[PDB]
Coordinates of C-alpha atoms and ligand atoms in Angstrom, one line a residue:
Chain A
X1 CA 99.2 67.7 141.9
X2 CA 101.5 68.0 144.6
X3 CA 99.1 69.7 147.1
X4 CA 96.9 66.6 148.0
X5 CA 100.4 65.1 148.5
X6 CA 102.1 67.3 151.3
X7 CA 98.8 67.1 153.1
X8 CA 98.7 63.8 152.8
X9 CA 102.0 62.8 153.3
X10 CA 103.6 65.6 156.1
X11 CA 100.7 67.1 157.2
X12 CA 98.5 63.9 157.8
X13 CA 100.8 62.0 159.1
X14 CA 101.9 64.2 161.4
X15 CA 98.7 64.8 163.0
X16 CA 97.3 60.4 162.8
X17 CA 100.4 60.0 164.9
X18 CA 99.2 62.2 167.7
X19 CA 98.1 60.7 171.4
X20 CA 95.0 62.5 171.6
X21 CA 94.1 62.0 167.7
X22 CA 93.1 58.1 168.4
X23 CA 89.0 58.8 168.7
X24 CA 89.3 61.5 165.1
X25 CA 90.2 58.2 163.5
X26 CA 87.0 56.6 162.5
X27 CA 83.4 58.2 162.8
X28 CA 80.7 58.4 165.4
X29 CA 78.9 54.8 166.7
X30 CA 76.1 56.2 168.0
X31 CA 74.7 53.0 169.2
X32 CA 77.3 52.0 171.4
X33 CA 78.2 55.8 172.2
X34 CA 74.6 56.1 173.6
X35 CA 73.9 59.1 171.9
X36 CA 71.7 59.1 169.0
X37 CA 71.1 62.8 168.7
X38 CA 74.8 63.2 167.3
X39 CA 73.5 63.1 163.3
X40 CA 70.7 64.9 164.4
X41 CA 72.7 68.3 165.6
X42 CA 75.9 67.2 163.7
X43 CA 74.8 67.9 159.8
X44 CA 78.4 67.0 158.3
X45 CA 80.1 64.1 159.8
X46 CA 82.3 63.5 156.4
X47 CA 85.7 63.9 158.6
X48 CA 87.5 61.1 161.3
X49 CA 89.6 58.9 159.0
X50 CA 87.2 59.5 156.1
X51 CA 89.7 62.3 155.6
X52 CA 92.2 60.5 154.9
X53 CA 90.4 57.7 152.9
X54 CA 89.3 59.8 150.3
X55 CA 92.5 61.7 150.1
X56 CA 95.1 59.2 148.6
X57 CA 91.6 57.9 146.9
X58 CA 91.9 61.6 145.0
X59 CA 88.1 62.7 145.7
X60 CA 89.3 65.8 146.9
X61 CA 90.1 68.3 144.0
X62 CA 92.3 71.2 145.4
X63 CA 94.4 72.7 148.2
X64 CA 91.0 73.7 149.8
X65 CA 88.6 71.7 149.8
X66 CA 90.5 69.2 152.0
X67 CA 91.5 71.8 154.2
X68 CA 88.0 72.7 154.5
X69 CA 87.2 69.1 155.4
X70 CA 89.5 69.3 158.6
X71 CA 87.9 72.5 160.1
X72 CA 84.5 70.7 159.9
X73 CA 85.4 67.9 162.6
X74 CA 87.2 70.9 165.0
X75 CA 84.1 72.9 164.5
X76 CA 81.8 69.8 165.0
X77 CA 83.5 68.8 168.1
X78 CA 83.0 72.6 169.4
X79 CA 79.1 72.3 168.2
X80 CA 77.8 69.0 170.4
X81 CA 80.4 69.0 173.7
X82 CA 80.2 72.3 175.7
X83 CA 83.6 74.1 175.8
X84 CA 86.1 72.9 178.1
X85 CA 84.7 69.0 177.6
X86 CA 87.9 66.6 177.6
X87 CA 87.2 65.3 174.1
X88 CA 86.6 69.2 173.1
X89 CA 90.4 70.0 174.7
X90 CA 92.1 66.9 172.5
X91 CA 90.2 68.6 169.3
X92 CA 91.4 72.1 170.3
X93 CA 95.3 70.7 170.2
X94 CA 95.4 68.4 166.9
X95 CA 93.6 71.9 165.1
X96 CA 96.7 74.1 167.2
X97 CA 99.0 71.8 165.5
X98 CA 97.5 71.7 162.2
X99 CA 97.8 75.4 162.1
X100 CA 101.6 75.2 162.8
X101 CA 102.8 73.2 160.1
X102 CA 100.7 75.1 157.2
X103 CA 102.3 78.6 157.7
X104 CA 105.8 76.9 155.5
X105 CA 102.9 75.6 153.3
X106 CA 103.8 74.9 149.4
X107 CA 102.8 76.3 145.9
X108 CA 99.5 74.6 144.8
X109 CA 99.8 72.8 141.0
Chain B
X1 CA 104.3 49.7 174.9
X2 CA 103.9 48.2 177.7
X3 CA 103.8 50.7 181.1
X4 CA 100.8 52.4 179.1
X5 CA 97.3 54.3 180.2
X6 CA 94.2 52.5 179.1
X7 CA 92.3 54.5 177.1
X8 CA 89.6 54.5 179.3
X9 CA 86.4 57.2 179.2
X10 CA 85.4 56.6 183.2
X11 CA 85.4 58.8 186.2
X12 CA 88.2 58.6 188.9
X13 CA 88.6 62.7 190.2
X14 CA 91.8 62.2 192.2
X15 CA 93.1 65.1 194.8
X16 CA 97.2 65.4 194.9
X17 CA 98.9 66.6 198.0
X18 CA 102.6 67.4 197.6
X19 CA 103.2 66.9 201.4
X20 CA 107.1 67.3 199.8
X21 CA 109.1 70.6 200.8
X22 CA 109.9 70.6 197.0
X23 CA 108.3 72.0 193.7
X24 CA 106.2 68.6 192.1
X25 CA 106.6 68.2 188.6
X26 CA 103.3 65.4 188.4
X27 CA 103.5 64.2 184.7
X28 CA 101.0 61.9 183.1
X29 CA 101.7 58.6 181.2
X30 CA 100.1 58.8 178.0
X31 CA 98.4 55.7 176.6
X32 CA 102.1 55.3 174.5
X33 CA 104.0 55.3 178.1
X34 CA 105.5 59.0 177.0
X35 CA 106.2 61.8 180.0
X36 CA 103.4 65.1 179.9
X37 CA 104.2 67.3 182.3
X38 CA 101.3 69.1 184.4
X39 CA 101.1 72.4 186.1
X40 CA 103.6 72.5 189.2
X41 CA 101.9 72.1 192.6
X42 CA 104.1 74.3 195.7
X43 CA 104.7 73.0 198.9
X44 CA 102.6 71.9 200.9
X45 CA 99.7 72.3 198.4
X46 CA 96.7 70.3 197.2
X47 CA 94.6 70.7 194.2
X48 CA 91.4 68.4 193.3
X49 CA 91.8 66.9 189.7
X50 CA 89.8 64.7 187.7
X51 CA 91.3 61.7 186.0
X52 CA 90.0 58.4 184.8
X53 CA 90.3 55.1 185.8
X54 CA 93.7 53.2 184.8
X55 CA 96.1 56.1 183.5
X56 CA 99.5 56.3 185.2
X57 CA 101.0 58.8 187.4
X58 CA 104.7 59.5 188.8
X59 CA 106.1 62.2 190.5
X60 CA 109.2 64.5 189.7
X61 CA 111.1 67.4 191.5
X62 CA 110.1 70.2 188.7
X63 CA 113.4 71.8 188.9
X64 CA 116.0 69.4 190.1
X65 CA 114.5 66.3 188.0
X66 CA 115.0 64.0 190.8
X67 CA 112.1 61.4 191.7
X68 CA 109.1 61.3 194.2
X69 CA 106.9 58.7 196.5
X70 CA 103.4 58.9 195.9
X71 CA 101.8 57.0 198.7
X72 CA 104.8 55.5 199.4
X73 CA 105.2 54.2 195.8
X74 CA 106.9 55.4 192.6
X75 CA 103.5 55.1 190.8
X76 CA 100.0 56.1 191.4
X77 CA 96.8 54.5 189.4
X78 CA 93.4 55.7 190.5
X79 CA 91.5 53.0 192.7
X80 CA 87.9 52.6 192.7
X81 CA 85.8 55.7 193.8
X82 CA 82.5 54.6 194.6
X83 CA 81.5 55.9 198.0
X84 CA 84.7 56.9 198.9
X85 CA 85.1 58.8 195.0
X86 CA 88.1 61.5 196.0
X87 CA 90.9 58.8 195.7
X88 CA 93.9 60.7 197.4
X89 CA 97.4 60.4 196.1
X90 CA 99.8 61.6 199.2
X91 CA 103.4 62.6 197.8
X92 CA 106.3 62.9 200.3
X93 CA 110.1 62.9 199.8
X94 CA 111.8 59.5 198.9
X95 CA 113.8 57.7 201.9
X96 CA 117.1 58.8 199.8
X97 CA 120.2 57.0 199.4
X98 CA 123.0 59.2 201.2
X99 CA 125.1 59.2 198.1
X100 CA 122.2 59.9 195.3
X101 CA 121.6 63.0 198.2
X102 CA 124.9 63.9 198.4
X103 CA 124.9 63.3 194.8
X104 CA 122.0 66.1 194.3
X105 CA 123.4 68.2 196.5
X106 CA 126.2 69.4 194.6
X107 CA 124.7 69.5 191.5
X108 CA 122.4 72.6 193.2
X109 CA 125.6 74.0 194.6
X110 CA 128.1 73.6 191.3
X111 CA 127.5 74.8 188.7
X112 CA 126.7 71.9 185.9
X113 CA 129.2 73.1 183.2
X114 CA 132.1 72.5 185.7
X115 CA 131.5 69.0 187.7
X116 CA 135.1 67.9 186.5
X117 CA 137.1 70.6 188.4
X118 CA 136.1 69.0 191.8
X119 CA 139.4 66.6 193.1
X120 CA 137.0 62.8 193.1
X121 CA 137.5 59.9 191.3
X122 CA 136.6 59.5 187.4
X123 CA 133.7 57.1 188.6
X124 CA 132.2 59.2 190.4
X125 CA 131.9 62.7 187.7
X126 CA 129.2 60.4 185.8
X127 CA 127.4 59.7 188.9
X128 CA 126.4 63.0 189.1
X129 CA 126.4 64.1 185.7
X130 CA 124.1 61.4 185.3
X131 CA 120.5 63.9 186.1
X132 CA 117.2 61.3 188.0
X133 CA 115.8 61.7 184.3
X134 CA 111.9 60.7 184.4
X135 CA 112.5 58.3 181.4
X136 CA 115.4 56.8 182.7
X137 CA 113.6 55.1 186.1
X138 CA 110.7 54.3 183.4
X139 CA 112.8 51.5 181.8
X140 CA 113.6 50.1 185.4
X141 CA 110.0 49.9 186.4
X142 CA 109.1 48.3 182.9
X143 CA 111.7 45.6 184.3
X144 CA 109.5 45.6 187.2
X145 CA 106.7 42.6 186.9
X146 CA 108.2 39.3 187.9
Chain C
X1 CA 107.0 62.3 220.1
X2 CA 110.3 61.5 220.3
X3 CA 113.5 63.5 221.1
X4 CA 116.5 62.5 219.2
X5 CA 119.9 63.7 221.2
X6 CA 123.3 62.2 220.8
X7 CA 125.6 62.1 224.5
X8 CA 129.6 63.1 224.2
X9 CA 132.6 62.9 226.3
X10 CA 136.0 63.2 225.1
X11 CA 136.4 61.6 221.2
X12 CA 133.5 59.5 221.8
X13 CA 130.1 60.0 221.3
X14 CA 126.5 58.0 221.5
X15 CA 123.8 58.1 218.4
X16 CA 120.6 57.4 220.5
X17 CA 116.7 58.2 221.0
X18 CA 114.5 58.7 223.7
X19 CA 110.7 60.2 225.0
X20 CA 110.1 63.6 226.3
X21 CA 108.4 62.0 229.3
X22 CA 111.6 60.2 230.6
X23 CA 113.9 62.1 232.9
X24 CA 117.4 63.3 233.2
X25 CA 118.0 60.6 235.9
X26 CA 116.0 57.9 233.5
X27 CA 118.3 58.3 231.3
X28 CA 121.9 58.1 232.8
X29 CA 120.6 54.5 233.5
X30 CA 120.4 53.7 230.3
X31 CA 124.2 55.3 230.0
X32 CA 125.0 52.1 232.0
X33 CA 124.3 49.7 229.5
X34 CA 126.9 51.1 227.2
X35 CA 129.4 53.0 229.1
X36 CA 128.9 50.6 232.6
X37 CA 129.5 53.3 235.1
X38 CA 127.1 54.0 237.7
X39 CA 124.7 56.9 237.0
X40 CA 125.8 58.8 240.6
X41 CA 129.2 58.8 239.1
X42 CA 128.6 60.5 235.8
X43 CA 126.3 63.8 235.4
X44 CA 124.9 65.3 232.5
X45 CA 124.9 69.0 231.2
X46 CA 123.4 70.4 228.4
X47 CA 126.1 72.7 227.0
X48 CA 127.2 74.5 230.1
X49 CA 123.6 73.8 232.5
X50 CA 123.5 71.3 235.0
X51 CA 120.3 68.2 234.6
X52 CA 118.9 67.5 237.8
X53 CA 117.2 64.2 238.1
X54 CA 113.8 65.0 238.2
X55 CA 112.9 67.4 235.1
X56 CA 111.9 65.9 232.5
X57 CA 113.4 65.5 228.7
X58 CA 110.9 68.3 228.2
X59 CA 111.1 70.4 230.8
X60 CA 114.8 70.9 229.9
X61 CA 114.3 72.1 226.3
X62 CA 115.0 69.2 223.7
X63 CA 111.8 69.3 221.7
X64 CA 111.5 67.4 218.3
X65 CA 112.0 70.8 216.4
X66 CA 115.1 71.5 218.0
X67 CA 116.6 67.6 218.4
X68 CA 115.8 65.7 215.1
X69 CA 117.2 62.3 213.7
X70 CA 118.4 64.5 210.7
X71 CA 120.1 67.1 213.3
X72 CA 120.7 65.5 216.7
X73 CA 121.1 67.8 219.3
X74 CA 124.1 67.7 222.0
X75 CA 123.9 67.0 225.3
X76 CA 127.5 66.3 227.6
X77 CA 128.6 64.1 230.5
X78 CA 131.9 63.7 232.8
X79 CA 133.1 61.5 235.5
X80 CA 134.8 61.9 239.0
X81 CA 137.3 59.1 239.1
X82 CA 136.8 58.5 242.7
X83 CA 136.2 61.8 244.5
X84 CA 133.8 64.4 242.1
X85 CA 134.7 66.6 239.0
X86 CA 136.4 67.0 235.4
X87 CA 134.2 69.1 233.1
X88 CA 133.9 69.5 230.5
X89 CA 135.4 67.7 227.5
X90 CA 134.4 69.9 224.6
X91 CA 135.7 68.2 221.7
X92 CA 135.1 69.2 218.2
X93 CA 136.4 68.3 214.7
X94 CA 136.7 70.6 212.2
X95 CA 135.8 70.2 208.2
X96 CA 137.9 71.7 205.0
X97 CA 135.6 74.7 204.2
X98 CA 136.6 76.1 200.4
X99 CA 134.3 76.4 198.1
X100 CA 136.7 75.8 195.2
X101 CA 134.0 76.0 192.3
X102 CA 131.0 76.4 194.5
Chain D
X1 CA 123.3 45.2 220.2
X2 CA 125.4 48.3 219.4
X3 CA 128.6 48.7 217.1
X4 CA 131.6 51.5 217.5
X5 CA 132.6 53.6 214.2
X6 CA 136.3 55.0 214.8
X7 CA 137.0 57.8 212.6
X8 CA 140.7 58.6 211.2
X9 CA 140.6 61.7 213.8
X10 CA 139.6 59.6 216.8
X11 CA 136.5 60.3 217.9
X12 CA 134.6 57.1 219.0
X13 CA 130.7 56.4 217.5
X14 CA 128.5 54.4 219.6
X15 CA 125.4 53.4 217.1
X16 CA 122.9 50.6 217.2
X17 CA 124.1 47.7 215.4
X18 CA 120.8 47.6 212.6
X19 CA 121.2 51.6 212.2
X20 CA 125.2 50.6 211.0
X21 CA 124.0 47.9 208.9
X22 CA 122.0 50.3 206.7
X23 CA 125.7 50.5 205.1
X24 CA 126.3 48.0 202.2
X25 CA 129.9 48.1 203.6
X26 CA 129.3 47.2 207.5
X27 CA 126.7 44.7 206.0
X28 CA 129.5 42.8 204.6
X29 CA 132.5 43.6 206.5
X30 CA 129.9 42.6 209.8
X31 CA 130.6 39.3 208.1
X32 CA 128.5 36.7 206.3
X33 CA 130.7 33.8 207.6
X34 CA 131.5 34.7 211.5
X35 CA 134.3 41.2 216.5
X36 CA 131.8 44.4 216.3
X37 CA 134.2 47.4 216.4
X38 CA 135.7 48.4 212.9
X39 CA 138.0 51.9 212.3
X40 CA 137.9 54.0 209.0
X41 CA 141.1 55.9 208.5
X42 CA 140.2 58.3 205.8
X43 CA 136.5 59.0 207.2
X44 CA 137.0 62.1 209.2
X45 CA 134.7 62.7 212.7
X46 CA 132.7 65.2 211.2
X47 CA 132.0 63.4 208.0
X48 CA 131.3 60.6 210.4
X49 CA 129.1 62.4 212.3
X50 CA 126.8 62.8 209.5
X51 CA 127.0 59.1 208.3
X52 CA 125.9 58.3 211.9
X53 CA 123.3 60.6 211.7
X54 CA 121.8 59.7 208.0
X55 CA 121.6 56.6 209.7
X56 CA 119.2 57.7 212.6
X57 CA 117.1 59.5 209.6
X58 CA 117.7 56.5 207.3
X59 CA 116.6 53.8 210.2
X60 CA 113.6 56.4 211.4
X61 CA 111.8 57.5 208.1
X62 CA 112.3 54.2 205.5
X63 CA 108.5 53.1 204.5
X64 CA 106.8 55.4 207.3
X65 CA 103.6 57.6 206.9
X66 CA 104.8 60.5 208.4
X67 CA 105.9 63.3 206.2
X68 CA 109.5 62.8 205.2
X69 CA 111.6 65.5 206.0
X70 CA 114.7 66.6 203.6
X71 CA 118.4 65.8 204.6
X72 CA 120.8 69.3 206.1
X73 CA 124.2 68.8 204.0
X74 CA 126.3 71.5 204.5
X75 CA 128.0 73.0 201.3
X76 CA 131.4 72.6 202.7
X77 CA 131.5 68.9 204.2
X78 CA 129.2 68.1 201.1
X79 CA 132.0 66.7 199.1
X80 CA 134.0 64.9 201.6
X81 CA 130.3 63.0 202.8
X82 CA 129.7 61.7 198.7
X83 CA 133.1 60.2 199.1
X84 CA 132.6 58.4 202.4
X85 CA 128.9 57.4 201.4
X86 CA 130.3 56.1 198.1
X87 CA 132.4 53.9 200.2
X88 CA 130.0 52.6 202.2
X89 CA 127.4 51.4 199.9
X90 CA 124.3 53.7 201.3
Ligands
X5K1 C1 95.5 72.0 188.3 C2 96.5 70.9 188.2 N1 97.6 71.0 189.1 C3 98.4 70.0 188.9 S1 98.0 69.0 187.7 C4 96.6 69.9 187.3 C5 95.7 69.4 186.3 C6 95.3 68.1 186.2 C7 94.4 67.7 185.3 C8 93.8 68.5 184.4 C9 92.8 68.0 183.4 N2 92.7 66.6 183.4 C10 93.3 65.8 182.5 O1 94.0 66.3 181.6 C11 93.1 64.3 182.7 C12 94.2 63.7 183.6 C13 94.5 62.4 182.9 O2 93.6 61.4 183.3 C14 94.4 62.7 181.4 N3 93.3 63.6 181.4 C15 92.5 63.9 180.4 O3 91.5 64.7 180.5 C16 92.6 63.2 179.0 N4 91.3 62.7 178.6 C17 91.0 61.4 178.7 O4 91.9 60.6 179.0 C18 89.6 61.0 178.3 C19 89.1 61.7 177.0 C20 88.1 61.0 176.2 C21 86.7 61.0 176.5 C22 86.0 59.9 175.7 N5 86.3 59.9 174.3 C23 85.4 60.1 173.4 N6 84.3 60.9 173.7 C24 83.4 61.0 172.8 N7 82.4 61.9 173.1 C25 81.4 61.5 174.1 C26 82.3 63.2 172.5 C27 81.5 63.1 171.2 C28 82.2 63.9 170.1 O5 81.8 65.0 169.7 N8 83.3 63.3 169.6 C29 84.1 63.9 168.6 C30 85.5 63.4 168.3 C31 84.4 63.1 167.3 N9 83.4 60.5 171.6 C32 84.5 59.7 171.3 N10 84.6 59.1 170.2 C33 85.1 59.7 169.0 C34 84.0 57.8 169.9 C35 84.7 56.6 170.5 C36 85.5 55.7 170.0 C37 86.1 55.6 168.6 N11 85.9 54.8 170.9 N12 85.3 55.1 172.0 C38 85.5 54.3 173.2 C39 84.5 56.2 171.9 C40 83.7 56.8 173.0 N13 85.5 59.5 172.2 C41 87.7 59.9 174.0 C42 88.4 61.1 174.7 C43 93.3 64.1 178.0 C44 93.6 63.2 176.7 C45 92.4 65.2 177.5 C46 94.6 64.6 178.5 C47 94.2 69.9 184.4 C48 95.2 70.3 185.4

């Protein structure tokens, strides 16, 4: 399967390496965030490092179902911060990069 | 990994100036000390900006990539707002070394592919084929904490 | 504020500042302390116009947009030797021009 | 208190000692060990006039608060003034 590979590997790492991708790295501490009505509005938090944990861990089966996991935290950014919010702007450019490097993207196996 | 931005989530909302005759280039340190440019200010205009407390800030000519003083100073970092919260960041024209003037002078009135058909010592072509890049005062002020 | 001029007579010239309240006659004293000759001996023009000694730096033009430490502007003296006269010095230099590449 | 500049030309410069000294060269020539006049006979008047006057502008403006103005080089003395200002260590 060499399409949970050039996501993982290329189009991953590409995107963990990014200055504004620090805070999509682990998910939500509503405690300390002091904001408990995140999970509340927010029904699928499954993204922010969990994508990558269960990607070399092979819990996600084809070339679109992972892919499918990344919109989710763009789209759950969008949902909770009103457009134009800081933390909504860093979403907006790791999901304009995404999109750049999957138009040369491979045959699925 | 050192000259960095904090990553820091507090309010600062500081107002530039460009008192400079020139087109500003202001570019932001990111939290890996890398140069991001931000939109171009004219002379002899000010824009209010937000920003938080403890990220970076230098100033460049946009078009002839020489350097700028903010506040009399190379760098700016926002202060401490309370009371007094637009923290104001002043940019005027560096007191320039006659030669580094000279020097930019005839890089705007040569053309840059030339520089070696003017009759001056070998010295001095990569003096001015050397270009004020951003990066390359960023090493000297890394240098710069005794 | 301040006016900066610059004073010439033959190849020499003087690279000073001074305030538009002071007069003409102020500041041939001040001429003294570099070229020690008495001010009634030496008078000052301003490029073909007699200073007399009581209008000001002001009242004689030279304003800080038109005399600036970055561009200086002229002003010219001559002596009398012992009787009176000997405008008017004009002395120049002159710079290679050619744009070779420019 | 003030210190002449003789160009190769002639003309005599009559500048304040401290406005010279701006120059890395009449810093050291002026001597660390010791008699205030000194001649340059490839530094032409009119180049000289504009070291003289960077010097006014570089003695006036250094650490000040008021809006620091840009220096005139004309295109044509431009490249004789690089080579004088190289020499002189300013
Ligand atoms: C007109 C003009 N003419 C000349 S120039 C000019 C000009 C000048 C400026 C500008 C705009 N001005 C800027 O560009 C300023 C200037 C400079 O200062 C940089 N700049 C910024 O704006 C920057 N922004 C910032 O630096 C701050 C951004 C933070 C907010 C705080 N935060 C953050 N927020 C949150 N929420 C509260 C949202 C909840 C949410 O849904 N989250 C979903 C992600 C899951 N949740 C988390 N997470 C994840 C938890 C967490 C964890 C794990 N740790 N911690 C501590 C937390 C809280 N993190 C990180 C992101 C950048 C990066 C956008 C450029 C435009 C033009």
């Amino acid at each position: 399967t060499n399409q949970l590979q050039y996501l993982l590997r290329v189009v991953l790492k590409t995107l963990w390496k990014h200055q504004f991708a620090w805070p999509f790295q682990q998910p939500v501490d509503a405690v300390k965030l002091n904001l408990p009505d995140y999970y509340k509005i927010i029904k699928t938090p499954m993204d922010m490092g969990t994508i990558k944990k269960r990607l070399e861990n092979n819990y996600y089966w084809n070339a679109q179902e992972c892919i499918q996991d990344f919109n989710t935290m763009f789209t759950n950014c969008y949902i909770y911060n009103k457009p134009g919010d800081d933390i909504v702007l860093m979403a907006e450019a790791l999901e304009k990069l995404f999109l750049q490097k999957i138009n040369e993207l491979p045959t699925e196996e | 990994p050192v000259l960095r931005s904090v990553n820091s989530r507090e309010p600062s909302q500081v107002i530039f100036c460009n008192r400079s005759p020139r087109v500003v280039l202001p570019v932001w340190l990111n939290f890996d000390g890398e140069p991001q440019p931000y939109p171009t200010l004219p002379p002899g205009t000010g824009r209010r900006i937000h920003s938080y407390r403890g990220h970076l800030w230098l100033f460049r000519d946009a078009g002839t990539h020489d350097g700028l003083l903010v506040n009399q100073t190379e760098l700016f970092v926002p202060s401490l707002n309370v009371d007094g919260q637009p923290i104001f960041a002043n940019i005027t024209l560096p007191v320039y070394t006659l030669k580094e003037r000279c020097l930019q002078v005839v890089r705007s009135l040569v053309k840059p592919e030339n520089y070696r058909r003017l009759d001056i010592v070998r010295s001095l072509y990569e003096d001015l084929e050397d270009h004020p890049n951003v990066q390359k005062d960023l090493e000297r002020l890394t240098q710069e904490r005794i | 504020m301040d006016v900066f001029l610059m004073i010439r007579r033959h190849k020499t010239t003087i690279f000073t500042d001074a305030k538009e309240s002071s007069t003409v006659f102020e500041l041939k004293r001040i001429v003294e302390g570099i070229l020690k000759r008495p001010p009634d001996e030496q008078r000052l023009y301003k490029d073909d116009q007699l200073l007399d000694d009581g209008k000001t730096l002001g009242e004689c033009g030279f304003t800080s947009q038109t005399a600036r430490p970055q561009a200086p502007a002229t002003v010219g003296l001559a002596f009398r030797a012992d009787d009176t006269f000997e405008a008017l010095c004009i002395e120049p230099f002159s710079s290679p021009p050619e744009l070779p590449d420019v | 208190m003030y210190v002449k500049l003789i160009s190769s030309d002639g003309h005599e410069f009559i500048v304040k000692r401290e406005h010279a000294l701006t120059s890395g060269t009449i810093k050291a020539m002026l001597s660390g060990p010791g008699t205030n006049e000194v001649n340059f006979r490839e530094i032409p008047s009119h180049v000289l006039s504009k070291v003289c006057m960077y010097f006014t502008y570089k003695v006036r403006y250094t650490n000040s608060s008021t809006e620091i103005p840009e220096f005139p080089i004309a295109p044509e003395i431009a490249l004789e003034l690089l080579m004088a200002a190289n020499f002189l260590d300013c």
